[PDB]
Amino acid sequence: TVGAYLPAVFEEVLDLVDAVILTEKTALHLRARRNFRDFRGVSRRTGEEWLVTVQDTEAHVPDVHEEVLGVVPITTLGPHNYCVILDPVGPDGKNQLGQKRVVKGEKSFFLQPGEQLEQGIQDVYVLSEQQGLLLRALQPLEEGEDEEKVSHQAGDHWLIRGPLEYVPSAKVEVVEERQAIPLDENEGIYVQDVKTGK
Amino acid sequence: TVGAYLPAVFEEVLDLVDAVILTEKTALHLRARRNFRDFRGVSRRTGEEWLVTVQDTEAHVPDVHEEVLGVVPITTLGPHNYCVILDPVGPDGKNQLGQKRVVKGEKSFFLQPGEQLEQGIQDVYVLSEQQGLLLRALQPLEEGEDEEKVSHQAGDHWLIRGPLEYVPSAKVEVVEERQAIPLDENEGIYVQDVKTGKVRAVIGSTYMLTQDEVLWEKELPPGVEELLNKGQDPLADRGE
Amino acid sequence: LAPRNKTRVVSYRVPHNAAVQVYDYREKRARVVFGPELVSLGPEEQFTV
């Protein structure tokens, strides 16, 4: 109730809790101390943490139950940026522990309570025609984000080159930055195909 | 009962036991001091230990009987990770002592009361085409996780190579990391098939040593080794 | 003076009157070439010193 509040004989006033102002670049990371339902209307278990954003409330006030662990700044990615979410949040709302998820460009999102960035706001690999990439499928049959939908097996390498803005998936791993060697006529290099030995 | 509790004339208050908050990454490892039934409804014997997770209760409070030995963090394995559980829990709920169980990737699980990791969160062996593995079946007739379901006998080696994300089973044991030697035409190595004892000259593609082959050192007679290093071209190098 | 790159194909510019014979050891074919052409060694072609 807004205004001068007169506490009763039974109630002992401790302090005025200040509502934290939520902007589009910030959100409230808080846990729950007791089982209760917040102002949104969804019951929260003991110890469950969640985020309060502007889409819920413009100015949320840390509740008697809710323990504010701290504000969380937004994790914005530009069109030339990607990031790897460690332990992402699945469709059930719980963290998928041990898994990782890649986020593409131009997606301003909030770090959920448990999600961490693997290395931060990484840069997506853009490549020229004479530039390229050597990869390593950490898992089997990725067969994703491939033009020919070719499926590499686990552990074998492949080459991605040309004008491609490539973002390494959670299964693949970039081994080394490969650059094409400029050779004109009557000049060249000695390549060794180690798959066949010649 | 929540609120201010007024103890009776018979009851002596010792302390307020705090309920421990259970997250998905933690669980309560506790034993039992007396025979009783917990809040789930399953009777627990004296000295039996078990785990309390979020699927049971979000906030369990260490009971008068239950002795909390400590919290147990989750044992999460990524898609490129495996681990070996020492003394796993069988279908009867008791530990299978002396046995070990391998856990594959992407399985976040809790260490049961008695289960230990053999070496921790190990990494699964991914292999390229020119990389490989030499194994040793510590037991007999594994005939598992094999493409041809071939069954090795106890103690014999085999070779696993190629694009395979291989995770060593509880019966097998990885001996050494084997790498294929890149050889073009008119070049090669001297492999010695120790199963049959014979030594051959392999020349051609990039050869990878099999399960029963070791590199053979050709000992040239003395003097000849000088004539191969010195005489690179005797048509031009002839004055000395 | 500068050290050569071992990766690059060994090319020798033959003058118009000179002649170089190269031994392609991989296929045991010996060819000798002359003219304005620079000869390029293969994976195992070697010059006749």
Q: Write the DSSP assignment of A26-94 as a string of letters.
A: EEEEEEESSSEE-TTS-EE-TT--EEE-TTT-SEE---SSEEEEEEEEEE---TTEEEEEES-B-TTSS
Instruction: Give φ, ψ of B226 to 5 degrees.
Output: -75, -35
Tell me if chain A has a CB within 8 Å of the CB of B147: no
Task: Single out the residue of B146, B76, B124 nearest to residue A138, CA to CA.
Answer: B124
Nearest Cα residue in chain C from B204: C26
**In chain C, alpha helices (H):** none
Nearest CB to C43 within list A186, A187, A190: A190
Nearest CB to A197 within list B22, B80, B182: B182
Tell me if chain B has a CB within 8 Å of the CB of A55: no
Nearest CB to C11 within list A186, A190, A198: A186
Chain C residues with CB under 8 Å of A187 CB are 8-9, 11
Chain A residues with CB under 8 Å of C9 CB are 187-190
Distance from CA of B73 to the nearest CA of C (A): 53
* 3 state DSSP class of B230: helix
Distance from CA of B166 to the nearest CA of C (A): 35
Nearest Cα residue in chain C from A192: C43
| Residues in A 1-30 with any Cβ partner in B closer than 8 A | none
Spatial separation of the C-alpha atoms in residues C17 and A35, rounded to whole Å: 97
Strand pairing report for A20-21 and B131-137 = unpaired
Greatest CA separation for chain A: 99
* 3 state DSSP class of B21: strand
Distance from CA of C12 to the nearest CA of B (A): 17
CB pairs under 8 A between A and B: 97
Is B186 close to C25, i.e. CB distance below 8 A?
A: yes
Tell me if chain B has a CB within 8 Å of the CB of A101: no
Is C38 close to A186, i.e. CB distance below 8 A?
A: yes
Contacts from A142-145 at CB under 8 Å and sequence distance 24+?
A142/A169, A142/A171, A142/A172, A144/A169, A144/A171, A145/A169
Distance from CA of C47 to the nearest CA of A (A): 17
Identify the H or E element spanning A159: strand A159-161
Sign of CA dihedral B94, B97, B103, B108: positive
Sign of CA dihedral B213, B218, B219, B225: negative
Tell me if chain B has a CB within 8 Å of the CB of A153: yes
Task: Single out the residue of B37, A176, B213 nearest to residue B201, CA to CA.
Answer: B213
Answer for the pair B213, B180: CB distance below 8 angstroms, yes or no. no
Spatial separation of the C-alpha atoms in residues A107 and A79, rounded to whole Å: 8
Chains sharing 3 or more CB pairs under 8 A with chain A: B, C
Chains sharing 3 or more CB pairs under 8 A with chain C: A, B
Tokens linked to A183: 């050779």
Is C26 close to B186, i.e. CB distance below 8 A?
A: yes
Burial class of A24 by CB neighbour count within 10 A (0 to 12, 13 to 18, 19+): exposed
Chain A residues with CB under 8 Å of B163 CB are 137, 140, 152-156
Contacts from B90-99 at CB under 8 Å and sequence distance 24+?
B99/B170
